[PDB]
From Swiss-Prot, chain A:
Record-marked site positions (Essential for primase activity): 271, 273
Part of the intact protein present: 17 to 891 of 1058
GO molecular function, one term: zinc ion binding
Keyword Zinc: yes
Complexes and interactors: Associates with the helicase and the primase-associated factor to form the helicase-primase factor.
Protein name according to UniProt: DNA primase
Family: Belongs to the herpesviridae DNA primase family.
Subcellular localization, as worded in the UniProt entry: Host nucleus
Swiss-Prot record, chain B:
Protein family membership: Belongs to the herpesviridae helicase family.
Residue sites binding ATP per the record: 60-67
Known role: Component of the helicase/primase complex. Unwinds the DNA at the replication forks and generates single-stranded DNA for both leading and lagging strand synthesis. The primase synthesizes short RNA primers on the lagging strand that the polymerase elongates using dNTPs. Possesses helicase-like motifs and therefore may act as the helicase subunit of the complex.
Name of this protein: DNA replication helicase
Gene that this polypeptide is encoded by: HELI
Gene3D superfamilies membership: P-loop containing nucleotide triphosphate hydrolases
Organism, scientific name: Human herpesvirus 1 (strain 17) (HHV-1)
Superkingdom of origin: Viruses
InterPro entries in the record: DNA_helicase_dom, HSV_HELI, P-loop_NTPase
Subunit composition and interactions: Associates with the primase and the primase-associated factor to form the helicase-primase complex.
Record localization: Host nucleus
C-alpha cells in the first residue's frame, strides 16, 4: 500500500501493556501535488522538535470511515478534553490543525514546520472553506475518532490543500513584514535624531502601520474559499501598499528636514560613501538627482567644525527623502553616506 | 500575536544557531581541574580557567510578548525552562500548560543544586580584586566564583559524593533581572558540573551551554543583575556577540535606547 502514518490512541490507560509487544487511529509540483494528494483520498506524542514519535509498524480502509479499533514517549496521558480544548472546538480546526501540526509539518517541512500550534490555528481560522452540513460534545476517544474519521475535512480536496495554503499564508505574511521591516531597519540604522523623537517614530511606525483595520484587510484578502490552489480565491493583499504609500507620507512629512532644522539646529551667523552588497543593474542618475534635491532643500533651509555640522545636516536631509532611499538604499549595507557662523546645538 | 508570530521566527533561528556551535578540544573543561579545585578549600588554587557559554537576551516592557516568546521557544526548540523564583516558575507553567505540554518547571536554583543549607552561606566572604582592564572573562568567572565560593564548593562536594542539564543545553531563565550577576557564572559552571560529572553525551559532543535570559533589566536597580551585567560589561558584550543575539519586545533607559540604536538586534511587535 501507500506509505501513511497514524497517531495512536486508546480509551483506557494508554501504556506499554496496551501496546502489548486496541489502536484508535483518528489521523490517517503544485498542480501535480494536490492532484496526487487527492488521489490518495476518496469520497504517540513524544519528542526524539519531533512532535510525534512512532511506536511500531505493521481491512484498514474501513477504520477511516467508522473509526473501528484494529485489534492485534510523552503522549501516554492524552485526554479527549485535552484534544477538544487544545485543538479548538471548531471541527475544521480539530481535524486539519491536528493533522498538520502533529504529522504533516515535520514530514513535509517548509516554513510551517517552525510555527507553533497557535500560529497554525490562526492560519486555519482564515481557511474559510465551505462548511458542508454535518448530520450528527465529545466524551472519549471513540467519539472524537468517529467525529474526525467521518469529517468532511479529513478527506479529499481540503486535506490535500491545507499544507499548501499554510505555506502560501506564511509566504505572504513574511514577504509583507519583510519589506516593511527592511524600510524600518533603513530608517533605524543612521537616523541621528533626539531620543524621545526616535522612540516615538519607532512606536508610531510599528503601531499605525499595523493598525487593526489594515490587519483585518490583509486577513480578508488572504481568506480562501476553495482548497484547490488552482481555484484559490485569495486576493492581492494591500497591506504593504497601504503601509508604504498611505502612511509614510504623513510620517515623512511630519517627522521632515524643515522641522528638524527649525528645532534641533541653532546657527550662529560632503563626500559620498557606499557600502556595496551587489552591483546595481538610470538608477545611479536617479539616485544622484534625488541626493541633489535633498541637499538643495537642506541648503535652502540652512540659508534663509561647521563642515561637520553642514555634512551632518546634508546626510540627515538626504536620508529623510524617500526617492533617494528607493533608488539606492536597497543596495547598500549601511547608510553612512558622508564622512563627518557656527552651526551648533545638542546632537 | 498577529505580527509577533512572524517576528519571533528569527529568534528561533538565532537560538538554534547558537545551540549548534561546537567547541574545540582546548575549550571544553575537563573533570581533572574540577576535582583539583574540590581537593582545595581556598580560592588560592583557581587559575585563569575559561568556561565557554552563550547567552540570548530578551527584554522589553511588562509582558509585551516575552512570555509568549518563551512559550513558542519551548514549543518548537529543545529548551529546559527554568525560573528565577518559585512564582516565576508557577507563572511559566500557567502560560505553557494552558496551550501545550511542558514537564513540571523547576527554578534555576533548584536546577543547579541550590538547597536549604545554601541559604545561610556567607556570600561575599572572601576578597577579590580585578587584575587588568578590560577584565578577561577568565578573571570575571574567577571573581564570580570567589564571591559565591561557599555554595560552589558545597555543590562540588555533593557532586563528588537524573539532573536536567543532561537533557539539553538551552536553558530558559525567565525574570533574569531578579538573578544576581554572579549566579550567571555559577549556572554555567553548574552546567559543566553535570556535563563533566556524568560524562554526558553533550560532553562527548563538545556542546556549549546556552542561556536564554528573559526579563526586564529596568525593573531591578542596585542599591547590577545578569541582564545589566551582560548589557553593560564590555568583555561580555564582546565575547557573547550580544549585538546579534538580542531581542526586544515592545508594545530614560539610555541602555535600551542604545539597544534600539544598534541595527542588529531584533525588535518584535
Amino acid at each position: 500500500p501507500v506509505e501513511v502514518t497514524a497517531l495512536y490512541a486508546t480509551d483506557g490507560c494508554v501504556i506499554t501493556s496496551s501496546i502489548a509487544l486496541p489502536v484508535y487511529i483518528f489521523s490517517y509540483t503544485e498542480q501535480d501535488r494536490f492532484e496526487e494528494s487527492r488521489a490518495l483520498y476518496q469520497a504517540l506524542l513524544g519528542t526524539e522538535r519531533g512532535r510525534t514519535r512512532p511506536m511500531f509498524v505493521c481491512a484498514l480502509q474501513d477504520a477511516l470511515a467508522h473509526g473501528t479499533p484494529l485489534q492485534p514517549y510523552y503522549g501516554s496521558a492524552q485526554s479527549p478534553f485535552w484534544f477538544l480544548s487544545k485543538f479548538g472546538p471548531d471541527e475544521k480546526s480539530l481535524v486539519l490543525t491536528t493533522r498538520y501540526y502533529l504529522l504533516q509539518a515535520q514530514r513535509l517541512g517548509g516554513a510551517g514546520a517552525t510555527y507553533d500550534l497557535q500560529a497554525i490555528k490562526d492560519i486555519c481560522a482564515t481557511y474559510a472553506i465551505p462548511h458542508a452540513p454535518r448530520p450528527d460534545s465529545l466524551t472519549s476517544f471513540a467519539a472524537i475518532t468517529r467525529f474526525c474519521c467521518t469529517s468532511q475535512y479529513a478527506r479529499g480536496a481540503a486535506a490535500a490543500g491545507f499544507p499548501l495554503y499554510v505555506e502560501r499564508r506564511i509566504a505572504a505574511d513574511v514577504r509583507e513584514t519583510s519589506a516593511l521591516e527592511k524600510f524600518i531597519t533603513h530608517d533605524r540604522s543612521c537616523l541621528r535624531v533626539s531620543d524621545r523623537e526616535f522612540i516615538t517614530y519607532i512606536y508610531l511606525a510599528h503601531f499605525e502601520c499595523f493598525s487593526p483595520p489594515r490587519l483585518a484587510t490583509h486577513l480578508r484578502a488572504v481568506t480562501t474559499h476553495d482548497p484547490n490552489p488552482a481555484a484559490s480565491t485569495e486576493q492581492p493583499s494591500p497591506l504593504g501598499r497601504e503601509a508604504v504609500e498611505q502612511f509614510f507620507c504623513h510620517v515623512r512629512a511630519q517627522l521632515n528636514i524643515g522641522e528638524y532644522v527649525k528645532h534641533n539646529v541653532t546657527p550662529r551667523e560632503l563626500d559620498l560613501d557606499i557600502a556595496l552588497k551587489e552591483p546595481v543593474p538610470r538608477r545611479l542618475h536617479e539616485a544622484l538627482g534625488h541626493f541633489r534635491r535633498g541637499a538643495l532643500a537642506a541648503v535652502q533651509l540652512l540659508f534663509p567644525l561647521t563642515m561637520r555640522g553642514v555634512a551632518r545636516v546634508i546626510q540627515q536631509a538626504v536620508l529623510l527623502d524617500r526617492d533617494f532611499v528607493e533608488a539606492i538604499g536597497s543596495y547598500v549595507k549601511n547608510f553612512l553616506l558622508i564622512d563627518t557662523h557656527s552651526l551648533g546645538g545638542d546632537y | 500575536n498577529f505580527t509577533s508570530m512572524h517576528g519571533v521566527q528569527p529568534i528561533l533561528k538565532r537560538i538554534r544557531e547558537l545551540s549548534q556551535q561546537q567547541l574545540d578540544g582546548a575549550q571544553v573543561p575537563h573533570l581533572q581541574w574540577f576535582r583539583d579545585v574540590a581537593a582545595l578549600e581556598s580560592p588560592a588554587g583557581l587559575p585563569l580557567r575559561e568556561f565557554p557559554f552563550a547567552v540570548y537576551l530578551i527584554t522589553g516592557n511588562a509582558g509585551s510578548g516575552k512570555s509568549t516568546c518563551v512559550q513558542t521557544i519551548n514549543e518548537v526548540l529543545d529548551c529546559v525552562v527554568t525560573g528565577a523564583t518559585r512564582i516565576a516558575a508557577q507563572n511559566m507553567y500557567a502560560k505553557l500548560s494552558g496551550a501545550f505540554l511542558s514537564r513540571p518547571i523547576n527554578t534555576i536554583f533548584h536546577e543547579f543544586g541550590f538547597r536549604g543549607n545554601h541559604v545561610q552561606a556567607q556570600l561575599g566572604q572572601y576578597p577579590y580584586t580585578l587584575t587588568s582592564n578590560p577584565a578577561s572573562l577568565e578573571d570575571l568567572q574567577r571573581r564570580d566564583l570567589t564571591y559565591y565560593w561557599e555554595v560552589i564548593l558545597d555543590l562540588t562536594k555533593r557532586a563528588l559524593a537524573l539532573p536536567a542539564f543532561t537533557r539539553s543545553n538551552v536553558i530558559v531563565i525567565d525574570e533574569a533581572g531578579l538573578l544576581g550577576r554572579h549566579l550567571l557564572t555559577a549556572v554555567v559552571y553548574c552546567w559543566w558540573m553535570i556535563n563533566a560529572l556524568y560524562h554526558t553525551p553533550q560532553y562527548a559532543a563538545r556542546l556549549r551551554p546556552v542561556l536564554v535570559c528573559v526579563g526586564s533589566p529596568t525593573q531591578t536597580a542596585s542599591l547590577e543583575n545578569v541582564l545589566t551585567y551582560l548589557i553593560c560589561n564590555r568583555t561580555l558584550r564582546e565575547y557573547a556577540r550580544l549585538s546579534y543575539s538580542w531581542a526586544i519586545f515592545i508594545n530614560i533607559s539610555e541602555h535600551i535606547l542604545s539597544a534600539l540604536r544598534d541595527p542588529n538586534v531584533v525588535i518584535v511587535y
